[PDB]
Design a protein around this ligand. Structure first.
Ligand SMILES: Nc1ncnc2c1ncn2[C@@H]1O[C@H](COP(=O)(O)OP(=O)(O)O)[C@@H](O)[C@H]1O
Ligand SMILES: Nc1ncnc2c1ncn2[C@@H]1O[C@H](COP(=O)(O)OP(=O)(O)O)[C@@H](O)[C@H]1O
Ligand SMILES: Nc1ncnc2c1ncn2[C@@H]1O[C@H](COP(=O)(O)OP(=O)(O)O)[C@@H](O)[C@H]1O
Ligand SMILES: Nc1ncnc2c1ncn2[C@@H]1O[C@H](COP(=O)(O)OP(=O)(O)O)[C@@H](O)[C@H]1O
Lengths: 426, 138, 417, 435, 399, 111
């Protein structure tokens, strides 16, 4: 599974009454921030509000990103969740404001409900009559019939190099594709033709099923930002800048919104607003914060979660203005701030035990105590990092679990930020 | 020097990395590029000339067919095609410091350098070649 | 059913609620307080509607959260081209600030163009050398020339097709056959959809009005027009093609009546971030004939102008300040705060008790107003969790204890990580 | 749509026959010395004897530098081109600053190109009078002349053209009954289309039938086309005609405004001189009004005080509004008017004093007149007083809103009460400074 | 004779000198000292080889010339082929066609490998002037030394018959080969997540070998490719292999790159990021904040520090002898002692430069073995950095 | 090299004549020439990956005045292999394989 830094976080850990358990769903302690997370997740699930912002502020290593991932997991894959970083806004071929708007659009998703049916048929029965009317035969493993098609489908078919005995899929509305061979190409013993064959398909000749494709507004924008291909406008070569410079909002995004609203009123599409998690928000420029505090006010802006690690400092691009959390007071206001508190030594040991259980590492009692001590000495992340090489050495030495000797040896071998700075004075 | 092409061996599943299940791609009618074939006037005309539901022109199958064929034409939209069409010296130069001379002669006289070592183009070599990519390239 | 647009930050204001004599009411169209600013907004809105002059800019000043953006959105909703942008939108990597600002200015102006052309439409019965076009009320035969014969073949026109052809041999096959759809049981082409047969006279002249903004320079910019009208488009926008051609053509259309211009509004929110270059360009751009009415918003007082070490009121040069009518807003009071909170609760479908409203107003007075606007929905969700029918003081207090404000947040930063 | 702009009352410098200045100077009031200098420089421009000369309209804000600039521009007339430019427009992300400046200089220069062409048109009646075979050789069948019966609306006139053109006639579909566009020297035939007289209502076709020509068959069409040197530069820059230019991906990026000096100068200048001295065109140098010149970078001034040295550079009217300020792009290098001291030596400074309160009242009254709204004596006096207190441009902006307030209140003229109410509803920056 | 991979500075090292229990050695695999750092390198190498954990980072700190990059190159060599090892510098991210953040996230793509196995059938054969040109099914004389199959083929296969005719699943491709014509060949290809770029556009392998591609399609081709390669995993289609990303002189990164790395190492497919820095307390680029190693604390806490102590006289002379073995230089014990002295005084790299110059001088004077006079004359000719600094008194066009 | 005696055509069976002898080459279609390259009397020199129309065959006596200029019949054999010791740098190959300009596919020319 390739356990990652935030794998044990499989949820937010709220009970039925809404209160945050002391330790559940991989999270430990931090009841206030967990309650705020369980409130904003319900806010998101309501799907009625728009552009509401959240800020997971707190000291480093407090789990703000862990809380964001917990919110994402609790929401489920049915709603979009865009993990974003401040440095990503500094694009070279797109302006920062445009990248931010594209991320905002990606944070909105809609499900397209459609019932598509196919008309697979045999090519050997191809017998046109008049170029004005054509007939194709159907022969599957469960039935055999015939269909009647518009000559346009016959044109789109003959466009492809169809051959007797091929499996062709004909959609009721538009499109057609060829599958070569139906247990007859390899029978004649003729060599390969740069393509693989397939036996005849099972099931009825005519199939129908419900379709639900999760597409986001950004996909629609990108699709409408090109000529769609077809005629000579289909010219496409390497280096093509698919993420074009910008796209106007009034005449392109507005039309997308209008058509989406129309198809939703018709019941074909269903909107599912997502979440935009922008990490390292302090990295954004002031010219980015000024547009961010205005774009999130629109009636279409989704819920945006923020996380500022560092505290008060000079704002980017200003060099003179200093504001708390590295965010200007303009954007700081109107954003619900969720303060994250530090973990206690017992909570640190519990998190270490949960990490060991998730990653598969087995630690002893004294080993867990020593690891928690090393963690609270400098930081929990150092213990989380040392946990793996401890078990690695244990396995190398022939020990299944970690002992005091192994943890002490691996702690002396490597060094942490505090230890490094201590010896860096030389 | 005519250097040979650099063979780029790669897996076949690589070329099939962005293909989606045929039973999962929905008909995306959100393409606003239809303004290259439809007009606003003709759009309105179509809206004002849509066939009604009765359409008096196996029985339940035929009814469902009529229903689905009535559903699709209801889709109609256009951005702009008419407004675009509704709105709208190659002197001779020497291209150099010479007094007067045919530009063809100018370009033909001074052509010292030839490419050092141009090879042919690179060619991926996946032992399996999926039919989809080959058909698209053809 | 959830739609694209929903309750947001400025959706409670349905417009700039004013009387016939531009007398601001207490609160009618969702907006409350800011009587003088509301009357100024109404005056500038009437000025925009009049369109008697050009090159007028209005600056909306006031402290943060005083309803400046609210008044702007209300004027926009009551105002018909409208273009709202920010100081960071004009900053483009592939387009200089001047080019982007000129594009915005030209896109903030609307232009209506009336088009009248002869149209012939009817069901095709049979072709050939000659066409036999049928309609509901009559039928006619037409002789086909070389160009018409070539167009009848390059496009697969056939019987039943409802064809359409104006002058300039611009034939169109809008949709397919009418009756023949029957024998096309299973499959139906992508473009071969069906339409009802037209009626009335076969040949008929139709008058249509095309509404486009003055930003059509992109249409006459490159060989291909429709492509650049979707994405960023062209970045050059040569001065010649912009002024010597488009402006003159619009003037000629106005003279002959072919077209009519409608000046819109250009709202640049947070104008304080603009560079001295943009201000110097605006100084002249506001002097042109086809210049729209400009609106601005800024929360800065005596601050430095970006790009220079100079300080001036509103963080913008003095050269431009002498060209703007400043409309400063007034901070809301207890009654105005309570009324706007009532409006927000009514719009968000949230019911709260009188004590809850009092506590919310006290919070919004001790802290920012947006904080209370968010506490509204937060306490509503808390009550929903408790399954209560109305939000009580306990819910708002629990939320106040859960979510921190700028003041309390800064006060609790003593940890300093 | 009149669409009154900010300051459109200015129609010209309004100088008397003797060249002095007056109050009612065609819209603009006051500024005697400045308007006299404007008259001198516009006389210079009209002379078209000097080039690369620059003038600086230095003056405090509100002195109407742009006003008098537009006045002198209108006085020059639409004949000569007038390219207005602001210092901010020089900053381009695709093309360097100096090349933008050179393109603007080229735009400021005009060039009228005449073109006379003798062409024959009319309904053709082709007929070849049989002639004995070439007398120098043997016998047979030849054609010494080809008579074309061009019929125009005024009458008919047969032309015995050269027989070698018969190839062109057969090339195009030149049948008896269509309109052809003959050329005197070239002789190439370009069929316009059949005559409308044969366009039966039952024939479905377009762009094929054209009306008969009005006037004599022989027509000497004289057309004049005025295009700036920059237009010719752009036209000769990009290619045209085949060469796979129809590509979209690798060619749609038309903004290649980058330009070289070899093409700009040299061949283009030589062909322009050839058209001038040959009688095909007449050079028309215009003016380049550059307001906010202080906004330009030192890399722009260092190129300006070199381009002005060229013989082809047009007249430039700089209008700096700032005072002693550090030059942009320089490290705390203070210079007068934000312009390097080296460039100020090459420009004539036209100083503009502040408007007298009486001049303020005159400006307010004439702006109200241009707007088309009547103002009472008391209201006009109050407007003048407030324009004396704060910036003058604030008063002129109080006319339209006060006019609308009056019209909505049921009265026509702007009463003192209306301006008094607007002054409290809207105020200036000097009062807004009270934060 | 002369190859591209000539003798280099880090060429002597050809592995990591560790025992079965990761126990360092005094002299083995070109490694002399840095016993603790060598053991840490071996531990992190075994961790990478395990591949069960993702999102880990390590920093190799130490003074200049203390084997900082030598340990990294030894780890790379010990890792061996079949595992991507993206080695770059802190200045590579600063690209024009692509943003620095995009350059970095693409370098991450170059540090994760994926093995895919393809089973195809290839037929033998030899060219005997088949498929004659201008001068139907035709004729195909397929024959092999072990067994021959003289049969014909269709029209779309006779025109692709032509020295060894290695017909495969494609439309044909080129002593007679031995063995049965029908042979099952299982070929395995390893790509470093090239699917994101190999499926970016049409004719995009061109870009994969050109870098002309601008910033990739963010969150539109990187997440779908990840989901698809994950679906391949657990289904027997393909399996991903974690590589290593070595950023030499990482202090050139800016606050943006550090903030991006902070969260780039928190993904399922996050490779092991090994870094190295010589600077100590230095301001982070783009800001005035002074942090150790020029890296912010929020990132240093996310990685493990690895210090490299300086070498001693013994280790110095041992590394000198190892470099001698690498090169073709030979000298006497007195020369070894003199060179060890000069190195411990000035630096080891300068000592290697001096010994190379001394070998060259010896080869020039027809000598067979370098001596003390040779290295002395060399040191006299080639000056040291510190030596030249002392001579800076001449004021040679100061700032 | 040699004067083109026959140019009948995918694969083109061209005929080159020289002072030594004549050979009918079974050249590939990729070398099919687009420009004039007259079927007869045209002097052509080809190498394997572009063709060069050296000049017109020595038919100066056929016409007194013709736009085409003439060169003598090549005396060397039609098919000849010459070893050229060319000196190039690695960056040449690098930048060439980076954006190759060989081949004949339309995609290459468009790129
Ligand atoms: N409440 C918690 N319970 C268990 N583990 C936690 C909790 N909070 C944080 N952690 C762990 O601590 C680490 C902190 O990571 P992260 O969330 O990135 O810190 P930061 O607060 O700086 O974002 C995470 O890897 C997570 O596994
Ligand atoms: N008079 C008012 N009527 C209705 N809503 C108001 C009023 N004043 C403020 N608000 C509310 O205040 C919130 C934030 O104010 P905002 O417009 O951001 O202030 P500013 O104009 O300084 O940007 C908005 O969500 C808006 O709903
Ligand atoms: N002499 C004048 N007579 C009438 N109006 C004037 C006069 N001088 C200035 N104005 C007015 O001043 C306004 C702007 O002046 P402008 O030329 O922009 O000066 P500046 O550029 O220094 O601000 C114009 O709208 C114009 O109506
Ligand atoms: N333990 C060692 N064994 C062998 N060679 C070494 C050892 N330590 C250093 N070297 C060599 O000494 C020199 C040290 O340079 P290096 O450590 O690469 O500098 P940096 O890491 O600061 O770039 C290199 O030539 C390296 O190969």
């Amino acid at each position: 599974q390739r356990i990652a830094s935030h794998s044990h976080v499989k949820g937010l850990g709220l009970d039925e009454s809404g209160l945050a358990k002391q330790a559940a769903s991989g999270l430990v302690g931090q009841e206030n921030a967990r309650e705020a997370c369980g409130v904003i997740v319900e806010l998101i699930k309501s799907k009625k509000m728009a552009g509401r912002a959240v800020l997971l502020a707190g000291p480093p290593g407090t789990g703000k990103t862990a809380l964001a991932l917990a919110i994402a997991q609790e929401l489920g894959s049915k709603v979009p969740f865009c993990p974003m970083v401040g440095s990503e806004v500094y694009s070279t071929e797109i302006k920062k404001t445009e990248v931010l708007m594209e991320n905002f659009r990606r944070a909105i998703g809609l499900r397209i409900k459609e019932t598509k049916e196919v008309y697979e048929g045999e090519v050997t029965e191809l017998t046109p009559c008049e170029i004005s009317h054509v007939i194709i035969g159907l022969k599957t493993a469960k039935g055999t019939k015939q269909l009647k098609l518009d000559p346009s489908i016959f044109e789109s078919l003959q466009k492809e190099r169809v051959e007797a005995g091929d499996v062709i899929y004909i959609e009721a509305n538009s499109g057609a594709v060829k599958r070569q061979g139906r247990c007859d190409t390899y029978a004649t013993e003729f060599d390969l033709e740069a393509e693989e064959y397939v036996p005849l398909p099972k099931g009825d000749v005519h199939k129908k099923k419900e379709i639900i494709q999760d597409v986001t507004l950004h996909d629609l924008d990108v699709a409408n930002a090109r000529p769609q291909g077809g005629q000579d406008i289909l010219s496409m070569m390497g280096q093509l800048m698919k993420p074009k410079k910008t796209e106007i909002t009034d005449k392109l995004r507005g039309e997308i919104n209008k058509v989406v609203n129309k198809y939703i009123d018709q019941g074909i599409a269903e909107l599912v607003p997502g979440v935009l998690f922008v990490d390292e928000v302090h990295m954004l420029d002031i010219e980015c914060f000024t547009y961010l505090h205005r774009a999130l006010e629109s009636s279409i802006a989704p819920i945006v979660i923020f996380a500022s690690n560092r505290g008060n400092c000079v704002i980017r691009g200003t060099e003179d203005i200093t504001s708390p959390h590295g965010i200007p007071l303009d954007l700081l206001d109107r954003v619900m701030i969720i303060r994250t508190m530090l973990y206690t030594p017992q909570e640190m040991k519990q998190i270490i035990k949960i990490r060991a259980q998730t990653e598969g590492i087995n630690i002893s009692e004294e080993a867990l105590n020593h690891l928690g001590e090393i963690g609270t000495k400098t930081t929990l992340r150092y213990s989380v990092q040392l946990l793996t090489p401890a078990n690695l050495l244990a396995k190398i030495n022939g020990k299944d679990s970690i002992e005091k000797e192994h943890v002490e040896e691996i702690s002396e071998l490597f060094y942490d930020a505090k230890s490094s700075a201590k010896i860096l004075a030389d | 020097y005519v250097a040979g092409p650099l063979e780029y061996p790669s897996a076949s599943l690589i070329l099939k990395a962005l293909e989606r299940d045929f039973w999962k791609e929905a008909d995306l009618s959100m393409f606003d590029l239809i303004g290259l074939e439809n007009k606003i006037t003709r759009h309105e005309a179509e809206l004002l000339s849509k066939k009604k539901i009765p359409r008096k022109l196996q029985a339940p199958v035929y009814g469902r067919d009529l229903l689905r064929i009535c559903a699709l034409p209801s889709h109609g939209r256009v951005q702009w095609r008419g407004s675009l069409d509704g709105r709208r010296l190659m002197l001779t130069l020497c291209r150099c410091g010479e007094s007067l001379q045919d530009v063809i002669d100018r370009v033909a006289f001074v052509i010292p350098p030839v490419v050092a070592a141009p090879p042919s183009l690179r060619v991926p070599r996946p032992p399996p070649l999926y039919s989809h990519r080959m058909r698209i390239l053809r | 059913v959830t739609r694209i647009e929903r309750i947001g930050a400025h959706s409670h204001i349905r417009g700039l609620g004013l009387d016939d004599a531009l007398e601001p009411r207490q609160a009618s169209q969702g907006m409350v307080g800011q009587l003088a600013a509301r009357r100024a907004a109404g005056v500038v809105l009437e000025m925009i509607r009049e369109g008697k002059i050009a090159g007028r800019a209005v600056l909306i000043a006031g402290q943060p959260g005083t309803g400046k953006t609210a008044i702007a959105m209300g004027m926009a909703q009551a105002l018909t081209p409208f273009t709202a942008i920010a100081g960071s939108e004009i900053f483009s990597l592939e387009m200089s600030k001047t080019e982007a600002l000129t594009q915005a200015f030209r896109r903030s102006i609307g232009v209506r163009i009336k088009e009248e052309t002869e149209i012939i439409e009817g069901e095709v019965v049979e072709i050939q050398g000659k066409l036999t076009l049928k309609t509901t009320e009559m039928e006619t035969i037409y002789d086909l020339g070389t160009k018409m014969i070539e167009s009848l073949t390059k496009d697969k026109v056939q019987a039943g097709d409802v064809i359409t052809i104006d002058k300039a041999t611009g034939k169109i096959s809008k949709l397919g056959r009418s009756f023949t759809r029957a024998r096309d049981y299973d499959a139906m082409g992508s473009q071969t959809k069906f339409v009802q047969c037209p009626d009335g006279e076969l040949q008929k002249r139709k008058e249509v009005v095309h509404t486009v903004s003055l930003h059509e320079i992109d249409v006459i910019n490159s060989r291909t027009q429709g492509f650049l009208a979707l994405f960023s488009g062209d970045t050059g926008e040569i001065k010649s093609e912009v002024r010597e051609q488009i402006n003159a053509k619009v003037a000629e259309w106005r003279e002959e009546g072919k077209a009519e211009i409608i000046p819109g509004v250009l709202f640049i929110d947070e104008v304080h971030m603009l560079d001295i270059e943009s201000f110097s360009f605006l100084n002249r751009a506001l002097e042109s004939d086809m210049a729209p009415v400009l609106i601005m918003a800024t929360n800065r007082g005596i601050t430095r102008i970006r790009g220079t070490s100079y300080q001036s009121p509103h963080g913008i040069p003095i050269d431009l300040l002498d060209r703007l009518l400043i409309v400063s807003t007034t901070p809301y009071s207890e009654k105005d705060t309570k009324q706007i909170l009532r409006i927000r609760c009514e719009e968000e479908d949230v019911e709260m008790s009188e004590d809850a409203y009092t506590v919310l107003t006290r919070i919004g007075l001790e802290t920012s107003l947006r904080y209370a606007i968010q506490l509204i929905t937060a306490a509503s969700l808390v009550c929903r969790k408790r399954k209560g029918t109305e939000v009580q003081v306990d819910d708002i207090k629990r939320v106040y204890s859960l979510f921190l404000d700028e003041s309390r947040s800064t006060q609790y930063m003593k940890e300093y990580q």
